[PDB]
Paper text:
The mammalian outer hair cell (OHC) protein prestin (Slc26a5) differs from other Slc26 family members due to its unique piezoelectric-like property that drives OHC electromotility, the putative mechanism for cochlear amplification.
Here, we use cryo-electron microscopy to determine prestin’s structure at 3.6 Å resolution. The cryo-EM-derived structure shows that prestin oligomerizes as a dimer, with overall dimensions of ~10 nm in diameter and ~8 nm in height. Each prestin protomer comprises 14 transmembrane helices (named TM1–TM14), a C-terminal cytosolic STAS domain, and a short cytosolic N-terminal region. The N terminus of one protomer (residues 13–75) crosses over the STAS domain (residues 505–726) of the opposing protomer so that the interface between the STAS domain and the N terminus of the opposing subunit is the largest in the dimeric assembly and buries a surface area of approximately 1438 Å2 (19% of contacts). The angle between TM8 and TM14 helices of prestin and of Slc26a9 is 57° (for prestin), 61° (for Slc26a9, the intermediate conformation), and 67° (for Slc26a9, the “inward-facing”, open conformation). Despite purification in high chloride, we were unable to resolve a density corresponding to a chloride ion within prestin. We reason that our prestin conformation solved by cryo-EM represents the contracted state of the protein at 0 mV.
Residue numbers in the entry:
A (entry chain A), B (entry chain B): 13 to 158, 165 to 580, 614 to 726
The structure:
C-alpha cells in the first residue's frame, strides 16, 4: 500500500507565497461572453426551441409499447375527477359551472403544448377560485341595480373574472420572460409539503360550507380560514338535513371505495374510476327523488351546451385589480411549481421554473379570451394522476377530450346535481394529502430544523393568505440558515499523537491536548451577526480571557504594592517578585484559530479579529490563523488588517502547520535565551 | 527546526473510526443549568445590580484629574445645542416648546441614571416628533370644536402626545424585560451608517419647510420624504422673504464659524459654543427689529416658566394608537442602539441592547408623567458630544442643568425667536453627518457587498418609513449572506508535488493536476438553495458530465450497431470492439469533492449528493468525500444516505488522504487484474 508519508517544510503564508508565482490571469472579459450565444448554430436554435416549446421534444420519445395503457388509465381517471371538481371550483368562484367547463378544457391542452411538467394536472384550483369570487363580489356586490333574475349579475361577475384572469396571465408571462422564476431554487421540500398541506386545509375549510348546503358571505385575504370557519360554525343552526345527509352517505361510500381500491391494489388491473359512479348515482338520485324543491337543497343548475366564440375582455378595469391579479398570479405560479417540483423529485426528472411560469402565463392569457377564469395546478388531481401511473401529459389531453364530450352531449345530464356531492367528492379526493402530515414525526426524530421550517411554513400559510404566507415562509426559511450559522459547533480540539488529525477534545479519549496550545474551531462564516458570539465563545471555552488576565495582573500588582509599529505581542514585564503571588494557570503561549471551516470574513469580523489579536498580544499571547481559505486571505488583505506587515506570519496552511510553527518559535526563543 | 514530518496510515472513515472510542458523554442536563444562577452569591447580586442599574458602576471609576474639563466642555456644548434643537423638535411636534423643554431635562437625567452608553446624547428626535405630530393631527385635526384661540387644541394635542409616549415607553420596557434586544447583534456598521444618514436626510427635508417659513400639512408614513419635498416645492410661490433671508444669513454665519473652529482646532483650548451666540444674536435681532408683525414671520412664541406637577395621562386612548406607538418605540430603540453601537465602535467599549431598551422604556414611561413626549438619541448632538471630547454621561447632566437654568429664569428671553433660526441651526449642526457619505467610495473599491448593503439600507430607509425601512433593510442585510452563499468559489484544484497542500489549478502555475483525479471545492454550506448549482458547477467545470457520458456511449453503441445492494460503481461493460470508436477523454477514474469548507448538509443536499454518487457510479466513476466535518458526517448519517454500508468508505479525513486511497485502490485493482 501507499503509506501516507510526506516530507515538506513549514508552510506559513510568507514561506508558502514565496514558493508560488501569480498567474497571467487569462482574460475573462464581458465581450467574450457577449459574442457567445449569438452564432445561431442549428444546435443552439434547436435547443432554444426545445426549451421554450417542449411539446416537440418528448413526443418522438413517446413509446407505444409501455406507455399507452398507463396514459389511457391516467387520462380517464383525470377526466373523471376533473369534471365534478372543476364544477365545484366554478360554482365556488361565483360563476356558472359552464365557465368551469371551459376552464377545464382549453388550459389543459395549452399547458400540454407549452408546459414542462409531465405529471401535474392543470385546471381550476380552490384558493384561486376564492380570490376570483372575492374580486367579483368586491366589484359587483350581491345586490346590484340592472323575474328577479341574476343573469346580468352573473354576466358582470364573469366579465370581471375574465379581466382579472387576463391581467394575471399577462403579468405571469411578463415575469416569466423577465427571467423571474429562479426562486424555484427556494421552496424546500418541507416548505412545499407544508404549503400544499395548508392549501389542502384551505380547500377543506372553504368547501365545508358548501357540503353543509348553507350560503354565507365569502372571505378572502388574511385570516381567511379562521373567518370562514367561524362563519360556518355560526350558521350551523340554519341548516338543511337532507343535503348534509346525502353528503355524508356519498362521503362514506367514497371512503369505502378508496379503501377497497387500496386494499385490492394487487388484484384489479387498474383502479376503477369510482368518482364517475359516485357522480352519476348522485345525479340519478337527485333527478329521481327530486330534492331540488321537495327539500330545497342547493343544485348546480342548468348547464349550457356551447363553445362560445373568443371575446376581448374588459381592459379598463385593470386599474382596480392590480394587487388582486398580482396575488392570483403569484399563488398560481407558486402552487404549480411546487407540485411540479414535488412530482419531479418523486420520479427523478427536473422542471424549469421559468418555462413553467411562461407556459402558465401565456396559457391563462390565451384562455381568458375563451371565457375561462384563472388556472393553477390541482393538487388532488395531480396526486391521483401520479398514483394511477401517469407518465406523459397526454393524460391531460384525454381528460380535456372527456370534458369536451361531456360539454357537447352529456352536459344536460348534470342539471340535477347537488352541490353537496361535489363538495364531498372534492374532500374525499383531497384526503390523500392529509397523509402528507406523516413527515412531522419523520422530521421530529430527524433534523428538527426541517421540522420547524415545516411548521413555520404551514402555520404562516394556513392562518394567513397564501400570497403573503408563502413569501413570509420563504423569509423565515432563508433566515433559518442565518440561525444555523449563529449557533456554530464551537469546539475546542486537540490532536491524537503521531498524526495530522485534529479532533474535538470531547470526542474520542486519545486526542491529547498539546500543552500550551489551545485550538478553537467554528463551523460558521464568522460575519457580523456572530463575531461577538465567536469572541465570547473563544474567551469562555478555552479558559483564556484577556480582560480577566489583565484584571488578575492588576489585582496582583495592588496586592504586592504593600512606518514602524510596535510588536504585536509584548513579553511579560512583571518580575519574579510580583509573579510569586499569582493565580498560576496552564499559561498557554499560543492560541490558534483554524479557519478551514469558515467561508468568508465580514468587515465587523475583520475588526473583531484585529482587536482580538491586539488584546491577546497585550496580554502576551501569540495568535495564529490555520488553514485560511484564499477567499478568507483575500477578505483579510481587502481590509486594513494587513497594514502591519508583521501579521502575514500568523497565517498557516493547516492546524498541524501552526502547531509546528509555534513549536519552532518556542525552541528558537529558548535557544536565544540560553545561547 | 522541527520539520513537518508525519508517518501515519490512511485515515478514511472506517479505519479512523475503528481507532477511536465513543465518549462517556458527560451529563449536560436541563436541571444542572436550572439550579445554577440561583445561589444568590454577593458577587452575583452585585453583578445583577451593575448590569440593570449602571450609574453605581462607573461613578467610582470617574477620575477628577483628566475627565473634569472635558466633561464640562462637553456638557456646555451639549446644552447649548440642546436648547434650540429641542425647541425646534417641540414646535415641529405640534406642541408648545415648553413641553420640549420638559422633554430635554427629565429624560436625560433618567437615562444618566439608567442608560449604558456614555457618549450619546438623549432628547427629542426628529422622526419621533413627526410621528407624534401626525398622531396628534389624526386624533385632533386642525379644525376642532371646543378670541379664536388654540389653547384647548394644544391641550388636546399634548394629551394625545403624552398618551402615545407613555404607551411607547411601556411597550419598550416590556420588550426590554422580555430579553428582546438581541437584534443589536444585527445592524451592521454599513447598515447603521446608512440608517443614520437616511434619518439625517429625513430631518433636513422635514425642517426645510420650517426654514422657508411656510406652514403646510404634515406627512407621516411611507414615502414621507418625497411627499414632504413635493409639498415644500409646490408652496415656494407662497413665501416670505425676510425669514428665508435671516435663515440664510445665520446659515452662512454658522457654516463659517464651524469651518473656523475646524481650521483652528489646534489653537483654541476648546471649541467655542457658537450655537449659543447664534441663538442669542438671532433673538436679539428679532426683539429689536420686531419682525413678528412688520414682516409677519413665524415666531416660537411665549414660553411659560413652570415645573408642572406630575399628571396621569389618558389610558383610554391606547386602543387607537397601537401601531403608532409600536412604530415610535421601534424607531426610538433602533436609533438609540445604532448611535450607541457606532460610538462604542468609535471608542472601543461595548453597549448592551437589552439594557438600552429597558432604560429607554422606563425613561419614557416615567417622563410621560412629566409632560414630555417620546425621546430617542439625537444624532447631531451625539456626534458633537463625541467630537468635543465627551467621556462620561455627566455631560448630559450638565446639559439638563443648563436647560433648567433657562427654564426657571431665562425662559422669557426666547419669546421673540424666529423658527427659521432654529431650523438653520439644526441643519448646520446636522451637516456633520453628511460627511458619513464618505464611506461610499470607501466601500466601492473595497468589499462591494458592504456598498450594496449600505445602498439598500439607505434607499429603503429614506424613501420609506423608518419603522418598516429598518426591518426591510435588516431583511435584505441577512439575505445578503444567502446571496454570498449562492455564489461560491467553485474552484477545481490540484496539488503541487511533494506536499499536502491542494490549491486551485488557476492559482500559481506549479499545482499540477493528478492525472485521473478531479478535485472540486465549494465555499458554501451546500444546502437546498445551491445544491443544484453545486451539481451543475461540478458537471461543468470538471468536464465530467454523467448524462453526456451516457449519451455519448449510447450514440457510439448505435454507431457500432451497423439486505444486499448492488455495487455503487459498475465497471465499464463496453468491449474493445465498441470502445474502438469513442470520444476518448482523460477518463478520470475518481472525482473527490472535499467538504472541508462546508458547514452543514441539508436534506435536499443529501438527496443531491446521493443521486450524484449514483449517477457517477452508473457511469463508472468513484466518488470520494474529503475532510467532512463531524457535523457533516452527523448530517449524512442523520438521513438515509448511509443505509448502504458500502458508502462509509467514500469518506476521507483530507484531500491527500482521498488521493492516496484512490491510488491504493487503483494499485490493488491492477494487481488483482494481473495476479
Amino acid at each position: 500500500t501507499q503509506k501516507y508519508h510526506v516530507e515538506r517544510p513549514i508552510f506559513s503564508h510568507p514561506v508558502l507565497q514565496e514558493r508560488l508565482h501569480v498567474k497571467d490571469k487569462v482574460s475573462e472579459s464581458i465581450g467574450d461572453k457577449l459574442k457567445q450565444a449569438f452564432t445561431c448554430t442549428p444546435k443552439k436554435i434547436r435547443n432554444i426551441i426545445y426549451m421554450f416549446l417542449p411539446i416537440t421534444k418528448w413526443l418522438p420519445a413517446y413509446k407505444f409499447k409501455e406507455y399507452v395503457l398507463g396514459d389511457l388509465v391516467s387520462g380517464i381517471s383525470t377526466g373523471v375527477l376533473q369534471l365534478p371538481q372543476g364544477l365545484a371550483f366554478a360554482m365556488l368562484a361565483a360563476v356558472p359551472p359552464v365557465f368551469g367547463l371551459y376552464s377545464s378544457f382549453y388550459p389543459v391542452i395549452m399547458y400540454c403544448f407549452f408546459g414542462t411538467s409531465r405529471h401535474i394536472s392543470i385546471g381550476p384550483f380552490a384558493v384561486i377560485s376564492l380570490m376570483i369570487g372575492g374580486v367579483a363580489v368586491r366589484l359587483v356586490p350581491d345586490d346590484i341595480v340592472i323575474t328577479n333574475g341574476t343573469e346580468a349579475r352573473d354576466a358582470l361577475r364573469v366579465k370581471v373574472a375574465m379581466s382579472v384572469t387576463l391581467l394575471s396571465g399577462i403579468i405571469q408571462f411578463c415575469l416569466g420572460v423577465c427571467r423571474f422564476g429562479f426562486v424555484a431554487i427556494y421552496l424546500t421540500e418541507p416548505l412545499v409539503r407544508g404549503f400544499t398541506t395548508a392549501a389542502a386545509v384551505h380547500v377543506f375549510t372553504s368547501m365545508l360550507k358548501y357540503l353543509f348546503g348553507v350560503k354565507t358571505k365569502r372571505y378572502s385575504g388574511i385570516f381567511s380560514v379562521v373567518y370562514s370557519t367561524v362563519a360556518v360554525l355560526q350558521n350551523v343552526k340554519n341548516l338543511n338535513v337532507c343535503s348534509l345527509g346525502v353528503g355524508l352517505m356519498v362521503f362514506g361510500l367514497l371512503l369505502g371505495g378508496k379503501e377497497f381500491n387500496e386494499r385490492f391494489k394487487e388484484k384489479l388491473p387498474a383502479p376503477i374510476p369510482l368518482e364517475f359512479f359516485a357522480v352519476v348515482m348522485g345525479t340519478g338520485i337527485s333527478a329521481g327523488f327530486n330534492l331540488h324543491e321537495s327539500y330545497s337543497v342547493d343544485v348546480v343548475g342548468t348547464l349550457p351546451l356551447g363553445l362560445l366564440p373568443p371575446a376581448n375582455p374588459d381592459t379598463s378595469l385593470f386599474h382596480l385589480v392590480y394587487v388582486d391579479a398580482i396575488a392570483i398570479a403569484i399563488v398560481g405560479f407558486s402552487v404549480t411549481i411546487s407540485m411540479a417540483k414535488t412530482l419531479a423529485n418523486k420520479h427523478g426528472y427536473q422542471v424549469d421554473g421559468n418555462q413553467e411560469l411562461i407556459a402558465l402565463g401565456i396559457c391563462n392569457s390565451i384562455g381568458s379570451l375563451f371565457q375561462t377564469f384563472s388556472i393553477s395546478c390541482s393538487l388532488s388531481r395531480s396526486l391521483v394522476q401520479e398514483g394511477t401511473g401517469g407518465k406523459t401529459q397526454l393524460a391531460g389531453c384525454l381528460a380535456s377530450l372527456m370534458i369536451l364530450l361531456v360539454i357537447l352531449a352529456t352536459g344536460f345530464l348534470f342539471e340535477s346535481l347537488p352541490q353537496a356531492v361535489l363538495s364531498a367528492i372534492v374532500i374525499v379526493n383531497l384526503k390523500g394529502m392529509f397523509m402528507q402530515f406523516s413527515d412531522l414525526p419523520f422530521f421530529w426524530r430527524t433534523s428538527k430544523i426541517e421540522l420547524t421550517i415545516w411548521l413555520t411554513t404551514f402555520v404562516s400559510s394556513l392562518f394567513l393568505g397564501l400570497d403573503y404566507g408563502l413569501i413570509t415562509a420563504v423569509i423565515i426559511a432563508l433566515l433559518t440558515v442565518i440561525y444555523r450559522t449563529q449557533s456554530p459547533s464551537y469546539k475546542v480540539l486537540g490532536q491524537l499523537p503521531d498524526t495530522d488529525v485534529y479532533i474535538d477534545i470531547d470526542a474520542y479519549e486519545e486526542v491529547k491536548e498539546i500543552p500550551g496550545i489551545k485550538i478553537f474551531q467554528i463551523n460558521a462564516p464568522i460575519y457580523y451577526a456572530n463575531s461577538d458570539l465567536y469572541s465570547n465563545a473563544l474567551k469562555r471555552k478555552t479558559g483564556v480571557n484577556p480582560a480577566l488576565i489583565m484584571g488578575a495582573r492588576r489585582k496582583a500588582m495592588r496586592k504586592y504594592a504593600k512606518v514602524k509599529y510596535p510588536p504585536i505581542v509584548i513579553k511579560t514585564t512583571f518580575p519574579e517578585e510580583l509573579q510569586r503571588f499569582m493565580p498560576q494557570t496552564e499559561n498557554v503561549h499560543t492560541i490558534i484559530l483554524d479557519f478551514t471551516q469558515v467561508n468568508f470574513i465580514d468587515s465587523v469580523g475583520v475588526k473583531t479579529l484585529a482587536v482580538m489579536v491586539k488584546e491577546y498580544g497585550d496580554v502576551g499571547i501569540y495568535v495564529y490563523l490555520a488553514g485560511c481559505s484564499p477567499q478568507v486571505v483575500n477578505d483579510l488583505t481587502r481590509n486594513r488588517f494587513f497594514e502591519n506587515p508583521a501579521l502575514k506570519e500568523l497565517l498557516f496552511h493547516s492546524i498541524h502547520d501552526a502547531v509546528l510553527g509555534s513549536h519552532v518559535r518556542e525552541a528558537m526563543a529558548e535557544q536565544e535565551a540560553s545561547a
